[PDB]
Symmetry: C3
Subunit: 222 residues, 3 copies
């Protein structure tokens, strides 16, 4: 179409779609109850992202938000995505280490707060206040990071995989607040097509890359 970012939304759609089919096939032969859990969570993450990448591609997941003078194009569908896929990615981490349910409920709820405040900030018409919501969301993000590092005798199959996925998680998740801030939702420093490319690379890596490291590990079997 007439949106230069179209290409990145198309590529994202395609990579999430093929990741989903790859993990669907791979989990084909699994009967270990624990492994099945990791396969369900992990296949669903890019299947959901596939649908929201498609909706942005076709224009459904775009709206116009007036602020600081202009009519700003905001991809809201990303927050419908993340609202479900980010807790699921935290659940993969949580089950891996056999987390207490109280830590799991802290993680999923802090994550909800993160995305939902992210979404408010994305849709807020008073420019200055958009960054008060960014800050609140970043604080929930940093609570989550804190818990993944200080919130938790695992078998070494689990600890090595956990540590890797944990490192991947903090490095990539921590880049989203930065892209938002300098992108079209925030200061408007980086154009939307570049932003959309940044978010596509993070999203494919955080979902499909993350899942490839997880699902190739023996950590997931009981």
């Amino acid at each position: 179409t007439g949106r230069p970012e179209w290409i990145w939304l198309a590529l994202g759609t395609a990579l999430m779609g093929l990741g989903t089919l790859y993990f669907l096939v791979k989990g084909m032969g699994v009967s270990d109850p624990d492994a099945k859990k990791f396969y369900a969570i992990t296949t669903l993450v890019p299947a959901i992202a596939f649908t929201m990448y498609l909706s942005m591609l076709l224009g459904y997941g775009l709206t116009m938000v007036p602020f600081g003078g202009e009519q700003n194009p905001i991809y809201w569908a990303r927050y419908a995505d993340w609202l479900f896929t980010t807790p699921l990615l935290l659940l993969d981490l949580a089950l891996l280490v056999d987390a207490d349910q109280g830590t799991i409920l802290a993680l999923v709820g802090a994550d909800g707060i993160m995305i939902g405040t992210g979404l408010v900030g994305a849709l807020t018409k008073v420019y200055s206040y958009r960054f008060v919501w960014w800050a609140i969301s970043t604080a929930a993000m940093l609570y989550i990071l804190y818990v993944l590092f200080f919130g938790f005798s695992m078998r070494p199959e689990v600890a090595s995989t956990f540590k890797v996925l944990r490192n991947v998680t903090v490095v990539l998740w921590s880049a989203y607040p930065v892209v938002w801030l300098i992108g079209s939702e925030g200061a408007g420093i980086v154009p939307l097509n570049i932003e959309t490319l940044l978010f596509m690379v993070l999203d494919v890596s955080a979902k499909v890359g993350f899942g490839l490291i997880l699902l190739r590990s023996r950590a997931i079997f009981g």
Copy 2:
């Protein structure tokens, strides 16, 4: 009112309302923890549908979607309904056979995808793309059907009831994609008042009929 389908929405409201009160009363005397589970899930399905049938009756759950030339009346409230009642109906099936949590998470998430893509398709303003969302939703539907047949030593109380409810589920659920397709959301082949009658018969049977077969069975007790 001035909507010919009003009658079917009124009848649906009434039948869901009486189903809810019937199951509420029936579960009155239950103390078996397992049976209580089946009674909670099963009573809630038509209580939620009661509220969304009422909202369509009163006009709240209707919006206008422009596409292929016209201003199309779309009952969106059906998707608020299904978003919660269809996973609950799958949970009744799942608990019955003592499903692994990984199979339960695959079912509920595939179901979310099904309804949420159904909803996108219902609200999409580009006529051709409405059927790309229909197709994606039908694929999640067929994954669910596949799992109910190939995804799963139960006591014979469970297997006989499970098989029946399973058969009821595939026959009725599989008719929704067809009604949508030829109805006002799709090709516009069947008028909205006839569509609304079709959806009312399916919905009462899939919820109240399904629950009557379930809740009259000894399969639900530990």
Copy 3:
């Protein structure tokens, strides 16, 4: 700002924000898995309410609903709040007494119905029908009250705390339907600024007061 209720929204924001930080700190040193559960649920309730009080403060969580002649200001964000915090408050009660999952699913679903019908009623443009939704919502409220009293050998640490929190819950929750009814959502008897003060006192007490009684009790430890 130019809204007289601004002050109560500001005070509510501040009290929910300090409650959240207080409970965050207090739960700092907890390792008992059961206590951690109570701390997660209980800290999250005012953290979520903090964000929705802020959004009403800044104007995001306000919309205009035309009915009975006028353009009515409706704070919708309260229902985004309650949709999650009221089930969490019921979960604190439920875990305390070691409730059956079927009773927990009845509680959370009745609560969803309560808030979601509350929200429909708040946004309904036909004045008379707003009170049909109020009535349906009040009925779910009374089902919840019934279950907390008749739905359930606990150790006396639990029974004393449970009884207190239970009493707090019915007295304060039962006042919300009254405030709505005579406030701006309903008959328009009490002005919006007074209503907003009423809701702020109930909300701080039902969340922060409730949590102080809970989290100071030994009932929460295994």
